[PDB]
Structure 1
């Protein structure tokens, strides 16, 4: 419940306004939003749990850590 990101609410995308494209798993969700767990009721994909290693920008974008690779 602490980690849930809720796409609904005031000033947000409502359930009647939801479509297939916004519910589905995007390739950019890797490390930023869990593709597995989400409420399986009427709001599939809209509410989703943050990833384990996810961090949040000051702006509000979700980061994820990667090890730098130099010269192989």
Structure 2
């Protein structure tokens, strides 16, 4: 699970303080491409899948 892990942070990506609230939610296109369950539950919810 450390492999096959999809993030949105890092270089070339948005910062944590600049993270919009809408990019943390589950779009309905995620069905089959990203898990809507497994994610860190700190101040990183939805930024890492």
Q: What's the TM-score once normalised by structure 2's chain length? A: 0.87
> SS where residue 28 of structure 1 aligns?
helix
| Distance in 2 of aligned mates of 1:19 and 1:12 | 12
Shift of 1:17: 1.1
Residue correspondences, number: 47
Unaligned runs of 5+ in 1: 47-71
Which runs of 4 or more aligned residues in structure 1 lie more than 4 Å from their structure 2 counterparts after TM superposition? none
Shift of 1:3: 1.1
Higher-strand-fraction structure: 1
Shift of 1:20: 1.4
| Distance in 1 of aligned mates of 2:6 and 2:15 | 14
RMSD: 5.1
Q: Give the aligned partner of residue 26 of structure 2.
A: 25
Deviation string 1:23-50 (CA, Å, 9 cap, x unpaired) is 000000000000011000111000xxxx
Q: What's the TM-score once normalised by structure 1's chain length? A: 0.61
Unaligned runs of 5+ in 2: none
The one of the two structures with greater contact order (alpha-carbon pairs below 8 A, sep at least 6) is 2
